[PDB]
C-alpha cells in the first residue's frame, strides 16, 4: 500500500520523508510523518511573500516601494537581485525574484522590511501557525542540521498554513490572488512535481535545497473541475545525490498524487 511504499522509497533514500496532500475543500489527507520537523528552505519564501502581503493589505508596505542595495549585501544564489544593484527592486520586483527564481538577497531584503525572521514567525503566529519557525536569514537557515529545530515546520503545519493563506481570509482577494500568480510563475523545481501533471492541470508551486542531503517541495494544484490540492513534500538527512534526491521527491510526488485522487 501507500504507507509501505513511501517507507521504502525513505530507505532507499537514506533520509527522512515527509508528506501532506491535502483537499483544500474537504480537510482530507494522505500524510506521511506529517508531525515530525522538517526544514523549511525555500519554500519558507512563499510565506515570505504572504507575510509581505498582510502588510501590504494593512496600509503598512506598499508593493511600488522601490529598495535600494549595493554588491555587499548579495548572498549565494542571488540571480536577479545581482544585476540591479544600481536601480534597486521594487518590493514587487522582490516577491516575484524570490519565489520565481529563488533569489536569495531578494528573500533578505523583504525579511529585513518585515523586520526579521522573528517578524515573519509572528506573523504565522497571527494566522494560527503554532508550529512553523523562522531564525535566520538566506543562506545559513539551508543548514538543515538534524535534531535541529531551527527554520523547521512540519508537514501537517505548512499545508494547514497554506491553505489558510490561499483560500482562507488572512490575505486580501487581490493579495490572495497576487500570491498564486507568483507561485505559479515558479521557474525552478520543475521535476519534481510539474513535470509529472497533465498539462491542463494548474499548478503554483515552490521548491527548496539545503545541506544534509535536503530537497522539498511546496504546491497548490487545481485538477479540472475539482477543489484544489495542497501538496508539501520533504526528504531531509538524504545519502544519495542531487539528481537521487530530485527523483525521490518525484515519486513520491507520484505516488501519494495519485493515490489521493483514486481514493475510490
Known amino acids: 500500500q501507500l504507507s509501505e511504499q513511501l517507507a521504502e522509497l525513505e530507505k532507499r533514500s537514506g533520509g527522512r520523508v515527509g508528506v501532506i496532500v491535502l483537499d483544500t475543500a474537504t480537510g482530507r489527507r494522505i500524510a506521511y510523518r506529517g508531525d515530525e520537523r522538517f526544514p523549511m528552505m525555500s519554500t519558507f519564501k512563499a510565506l515570505l511573500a504572504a507575510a509581505v502581503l498582510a502588510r501590504v493589505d494593512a496600509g503598512k508596505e506598499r508593493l511600488g516601494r522601490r529598495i535600494t542595495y549595493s554588491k555587499e549585501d548579495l548572498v549565494d544564489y542571488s540571480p536577479v537581485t545581482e544585476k540591479h544593484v544600481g536601480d534597486g527592486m521594487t518590493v514587487a ?7 520565481t ?37 538566506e543562506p545559513e537557515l539551508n543548514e538543515a542540521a538534524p535534531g535541529d529545530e531551527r ?23 487581490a493579495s490572495r490572488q497576487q500570491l498564486v500568480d507568483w507561485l505559479v510563475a515558479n521557474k525552478t523545481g520543475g521535476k519534481l512535481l510539474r513535470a509529472g501533471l497533465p498539462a491542463d492541470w494548474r499548478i503554483g508551486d515552490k521548491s527548496g535545497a539545503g545541506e544534509h542531503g535536503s530537497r522539498n517541495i511546496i504546491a497548490v494544484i487545481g485538477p479540472p473541475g475539482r477543489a484544489p490540492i495542497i501538496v508539501v513534500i520533504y526528504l531531509t538527512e538524504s545519502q544519495v545525490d542531487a539528481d537521487a534526491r530530485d527523483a525521490v521527491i518525484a515519486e513520491v510526488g507520484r505516488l501519494v498524487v495519485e493515490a489521493f485522487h483514486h481514493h475510490h
Do not use: Q
Open 93 to 99: 520586483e522582490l516577491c516575484e525574484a524570490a519565489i
Open 101 to 137: 527564481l529563488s533569489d536569495n538577497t531578494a528573500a533578505n531584503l523583504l525579511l529585513e522590511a518585515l523586520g526579521g525572521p522573528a517578524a515573519l514567525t509572528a506573523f504565522l503566529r497571527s494566522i494560527g501557525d503554532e508550529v512553523t519557525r523562522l531564525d535566520r536569514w
Open 151 to 173: 527554520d523547521t515546520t512540519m508537514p501537517a503545519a505548512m499545508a494547514a498554513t497554506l491553505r489558510t493563506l490561499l483560500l482562507g481570509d488572512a490575505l486580501s482577494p
